Design goal:
heterotrimer; A: little secondary structure; 0% strand; B: 434 residues; mainly alpha; Leucine-rich Repeat Variant; elongated; Large T antigen (chain A)
């Protein structure tokens, strides 16, 4: 869910 | 850190003349030649960096950095080297290969402000090349001396241009990721960085934010060491600044932090960040709007109590707005924000989403040439039907999607080419429609 | 104001 740069 | 001439005859010298003067056994002749070189490298267009390197001048310039007895030649060569180091990786490498790093670090303690400043600038260019030179500058012990230059009761007594320079060089020491800066180097730098983040100069604040954004771009452990310093409230404040150069890095930093743990994300929420989003989500600058929606998606990917905060701040209508009309890349982030919301939200929170009008704009996007966003959307609907199933409302929803033309776009996708897509469609079709 | 890009990686001193 939490997606990064 | 800036200069003049002896300049009637130090302007537009030929490289052969510069070599002639530097090779003389005369310190003054070398000084004149070094200034001439600096001027060629400091002119407005196409500085002859490669010609200077080929002439083998770097080793001479580096040795002049150590001539404490002639500060003017220290300054001129420092400036010349700075501009060579500002070029390609290959040109910066030549300066490093000449042994410039330790020499510049030694110059940081110069009694002459303009000279230590040039040393700072040069080290910034060298570290700015990438991870390897950045870490090499750190191994040579550049951090302590750099930090000592900022060891004053009040940053305001420092020359403005001087402070901006130090801040920028420090930010480059916090820059780049494969690998990220040494953990202990980041710990050493943070305290001074937090202090700069409270300074009043707009450029110092901007670059301080950029450094923080670099440090928060990585594993949750890196994010934690920054959040631990209690900088979030300040980042939230800068988030509302009037200057776009400050808001951009502040939003990036905030956005990196919410990609972390729910605990770390909760810190930005507690600081009051959500109250700024109505404005960020409608910002005239398209990049701000994109990063704001991206940030929202990583918050809606959080806990239900966090999704509720998004609701309470009235941000859902704003998400419906961005989904309805915005640059495509922003619309894509919005689709993600929505699919994340439906994925972890309660039934009531999902019902609310539909009541705000998410359905129509969501369907209109299913007609985009981007298999990725399509997957994300079809995925969002699935989650929404599932909520209506737990409500025995699966029919009132089917009509809605049929009313706005959703079905006429899902069936068409059912005949897509990407297995992920046509499968997802078909499933929805046979499971909720006809 | 200015806006968009991250600070330059390298800067050449023109003055």
């Amino acid at each position: 869910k939490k997606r990064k740069v | 850190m800036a200069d003049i001439g002896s300049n009637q005859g130090t302007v537009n010298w030929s490289v052969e003349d510069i070599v002639k003067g530097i090779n003389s056994n005369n310190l003054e002749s070398q000084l004149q030649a070094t200034q001439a070189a600096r001027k060629l490298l400091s002119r407005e267009k196409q500085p002859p960096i490669d010609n200077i390197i080929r002439a083998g001048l770097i080793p001479k310039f580096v040795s002049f950095l150590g001539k404490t007895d002639c500060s003017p030649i220290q300054f001129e060569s420092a400036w010349a080297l700075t501009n060579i180091a500002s070029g390609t990786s290959e040109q910066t490498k030549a300066v490093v290969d000449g042994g410039a790093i330790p020499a510049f670090i030694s110059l940081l303690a110069s009694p002459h402000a303009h000279i230590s400043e040039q040393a700072v600038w040069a080290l910034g260019n060298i570290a700015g090349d990438g991870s390897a030179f950045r870490d090499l500058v750190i191994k040579h012990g550049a951090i302590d001396p750099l930090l000592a230059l900022l060891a004053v009761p009040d940053l305001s007594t420092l020359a403005c241009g001087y402070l901006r320079n130090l801040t920028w060089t420090l930010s480059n020491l916090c820059r780049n990721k494969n690998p990220a800066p040494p953990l202990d180097a980041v710990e050493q730098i943070l305290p001074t960085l937090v202090r700069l983040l409270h300074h009043n100069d707009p450029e110092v604040l901007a670059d301080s934010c950029w450094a923080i954004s670099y440090l928060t771009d990585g594993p949750n452990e890196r994010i934690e060491m920054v959040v631990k310093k209690g900088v979030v409230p300040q980042l939230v404040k800068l988030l509302g600044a009037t200057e776009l150069p400050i808001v951009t890095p502040a939003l990036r930093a905030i956005g990196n932090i919410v990609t972390g743990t729910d605990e770390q994300t909760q810190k930005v929420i507690d600081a009051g960040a959500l109250a700024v989003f109505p404005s960020l989500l409608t910002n005239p600058k398209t990049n701000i709007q994109k990063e704001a929606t991206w940030t929202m998606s990583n918050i809606t990917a959080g806990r239900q109590d966090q999704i509720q905060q998004v609701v309470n701040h009235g941000l859902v209508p704003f998400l419906v707005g961005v989904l309805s009309k915005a640059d495509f890349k922003t619309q894509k982030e919005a689709a993600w924000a929505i699919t994340n919301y439906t994925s972890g939200g309660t039934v009531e929170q999902i019902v609310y989403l539909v009541h705000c009008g998410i359905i129509e704009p969501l369907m209109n996007l299913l007609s985009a040439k981007d298999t990725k966003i399509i997957q994300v959307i079809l995925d969002a609907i699935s989650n929404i039907f599932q909520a209506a199933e737990k409500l025995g409302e699966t029919e009132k929803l089917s009509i809605m999607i049929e009313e706005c033309g959703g079905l006429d776009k899902i069936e068409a996708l059912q005949r897509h080419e990407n297995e992920s897509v046509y499968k997802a469609s078909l499933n929805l079709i046979e499971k909720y429609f006809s």
